Amino acid sequence: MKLQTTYPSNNYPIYVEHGAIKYIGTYLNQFDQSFLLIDEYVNQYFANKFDDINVHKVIIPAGEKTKTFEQYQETLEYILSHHVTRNTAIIAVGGGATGDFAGFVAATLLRGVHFIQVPTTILAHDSSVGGKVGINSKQGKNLIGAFYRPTAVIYDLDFLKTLPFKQILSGYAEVYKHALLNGESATQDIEQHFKDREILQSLNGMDKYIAKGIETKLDIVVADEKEQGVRKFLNLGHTFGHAVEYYHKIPHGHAVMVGIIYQFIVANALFDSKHDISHYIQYLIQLGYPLDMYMLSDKKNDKQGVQMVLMRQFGDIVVQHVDQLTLQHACEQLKTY
Numbered sequence: 249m250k251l252q253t254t255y256p257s258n259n260y261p262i263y264v265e266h267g268a269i270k271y272i273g274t275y276l277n278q279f280d281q282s283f284l285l286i287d288e289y290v291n292q293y294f295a296n297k298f299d300d301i302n303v304h305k306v307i308i309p310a311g312e313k314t315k316t317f318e319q320y321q322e323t324l325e326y327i328l329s330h331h332v333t334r335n336t337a338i339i340a341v342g343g344g345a346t347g348d349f350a351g352f353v354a355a356t357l358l359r360g361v362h363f364i365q366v367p368t369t370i371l372a373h374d375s376s377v378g379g380k381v382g383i384n385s386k387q388g389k390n391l392i393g394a395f396y397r398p399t400a401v402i403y404d405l406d407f408l409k410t411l412p413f414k415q416i417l418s419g420y421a422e423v424y425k426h427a428l429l430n431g432e433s434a435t436q437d438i439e440q441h442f443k444d445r446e447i448l449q450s451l452n453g454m455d456k457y458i459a460k461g462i463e464t465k466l467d468i469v470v471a472d473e474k475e476q477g478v479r480k481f482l483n484l485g486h487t488f489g490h491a492v493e494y495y496h497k498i499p500h501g502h503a504v505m506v507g508i509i510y511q512f513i514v515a516n517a518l519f520d521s522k523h524d525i526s527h528y529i530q531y532l533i534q535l536g537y538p539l540d541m542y543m544l545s546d547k548k549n550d551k552q553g554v555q556m557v558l559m560r561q562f563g564d565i566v567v568q569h570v571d572q573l574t575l576q577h578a579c580e581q582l583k584t585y
């Protein structure tokens with residue numbers, strides 16, 4: 249399969265399929281050079297699958313550890329010491345952390361070079377699309393970065409076959425977030441397929457729901473590309489979730505699930521949406537989520553206070569200030585579990 253962006257122009261393709269690693273060469277021989285940035289662990293995993301390929305390998309730290317100024321400066325300096333030109337290209341081979349980072353390198357290298365997204369994780373079906381890239385500050389998640397449409401996104405589904413469950417759980421929180429944004433329809437549907445840990449962990453039919461999720465975000469970002477409207481909805485649970493992640497050092501996805509339950513509660517203490525908190529808590533339990541596990545600076549805020557993406561009812565998403573009280577009780581109400 250192959251989806252694509254629908255902007256007036258300057259649009260990139262999104263090749264999603266098993267073995268899509270093949271479409272890489274059909275771009276390469278058009279760039280001066282190509283600096284393939286790959287996650288340290290991912291390298292170990294697929295060091296051989298990329299030997300087919302003007303291309304120079306750059307091994308970057310494992311996951312979330314690569315998104316720092318230090319690593320940003322280092323990586324930039326190293327690449328510039330290779331007399332690169334504007335017609336060079338960065339090939340992000342790894343997960344969201346790796347793509348965010350490399351994507352920021354390629355966005356700033358000479359005010360912008362060519363960017364190729366090669367997502368290898370489930371959560372990366374989200375991170376690889378949308379054009380958001382960046383690193384972290386001693387202040388929080390994603391405070392420095394930019395919007396840089398990659399030249400192309402090449403998603404080879406064969407990459408998933410090696411993800412431990414922890415990452416399947418982390419990444420599924422995103423496949424689920426998107427279904428939630430598809431209203432009560434695509435939701436109860438996905439819950440009815442991935443009903444337990446076994447089906448999830450087994451990745452059966454995951455392909456179908458990953459494409460469903462890319463297809464979903466692809467509409468939002470084509471629409472509100474600079475997050476000045478509906479793209480704000482994608483921050484569902486990232487309010488409490490970006491705070492939770494950068495604080496317990498738990499998988500991003502895990503923290504998104506928690507910000508999602510949290511968001512439902514805050515929606516009920518405010519809109520009395522009559523959300524079945526106990527329903528979502530058991531779904532997390534049946535899936536295998538680890539039930540054992542700042543917001544004043546998020547990117548949907550203003551000089552007034554907090555700003556959450558609350559669901560009042562399926563197909564009725566809002567965004568609005570929330571007193572730390574409704575939050576104070578929401579994070580004690582969520583303690584009930």
Ligand SMILES: NC(=O)c1ccc[n+]([C@@H]2O[C@H](COP(=O)([O-])OP(=O)(O)OC[C@H]3O[C@@H](n4cnc5c(N)ncnc54)[C@H](O)[C@@H]3O)[C@@H](O)[C@H]2O)c1
Pocket residue numbers: 287288289290293310311312342343344345346348368369370371372374375376377378379380381382389390407408410411412415418500
């Ligand atoms: N629009 C955006 O810019 C955007 C959207 C969503 C999330 N994110 C970012 O994405 C990151 C979280 O996503 P992530 O979990 O995919 O990142 P990640 O790079 O941290 O990957 C998670 C872990 O899986 C390993 N891994 C990667 N490929 C693998 C594979 N195929 N098999 C086995 N293990 C593999 C990595 O080494 C790492 O330890 C965060 O940094 C988050 O802020 C960015």
Ligand SMILES: O=C(O)[C@]1(O)C[C@H](CP(=O)(O)O)[C@@H](O)[C@H](O)C1
Pocket residue numbers: 374377378380389390422475479482483486490547
């Ligand atoms: O616009 C997007 O692509 C996102 O809202 C971007 C956020 C990152 P941000 O909240 O740091 O922008 C990401 O976590 C979420 O899954 C989707």
Ligand SMILES: [Zn+2]
Pocket residue numbers: 374422486500504
């Ligand atoms: Zn996310």
